[PDB]
Amino acid sequence: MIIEGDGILDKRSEDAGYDLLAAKEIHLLPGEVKVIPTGVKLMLPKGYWGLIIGKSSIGSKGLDVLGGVIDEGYRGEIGVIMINVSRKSITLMERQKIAQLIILPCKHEVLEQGK
């Protein structure tokens, strides 16, 4: 798969997703929502979409990743929406692993107004 940027890592065949990296150091206040830059662009194969999902490693710190849908046609850089649900401030370091990207098949169908 064609990509641009270095905020993503190759994966084992036995793994479902690619690790996504935080482009820069981020500071999340309590309850704050942030869109974390990864610095990568993707060219997904025709017929598939990218699923941004969290890693147990950072989830276990009170950081939730909000469902991420990457469209086959998206050409901009990937961003990870993250909320700090803890009562204290949290800091993500540069290049730290923040989420996963899973490539799944997507079905296309026109909508008929039936019963």
Ligand X SMILES: O=c1ccn([C@@H]2O[C@H](COP(=O)(O)OP(=O)(O)O)[C@@H](O)[C@H]2O)c(=O)[nH]1
Total site size for ligand X, rule CB under 6 A: 15
Q: Which of residues 42-61 bind its own copies (CB under 8 A)?
A: 42-43, 45, 48-49, 53-56, 59-61
Cα Rg for the chain, rounded, in angstroms?
16
Consecutive H or E run containing 63: strand 63-65
CA 29 – CA 90 distance, rounded (Å): 7
Given candidates 3, 81, 83, 106, which one binds ligand X under the rule CB under 6 A? 81
Residue 104 engages its own copies in binding (rule: CB under 8 A):
yes
Q: How far is the CB of 12 from ligand X (least distance, A)?
A: 10
List, in sequence order, every residue forming a beta bridge with 26; answer none if it has no partner. Answer: 92
Q: Which residues pair with 102 in a beta bridge?
A: 51
Contact partner at residue 91 from its own copies, ligand X, none, CB < 5 to 8 Å by partner kind = none
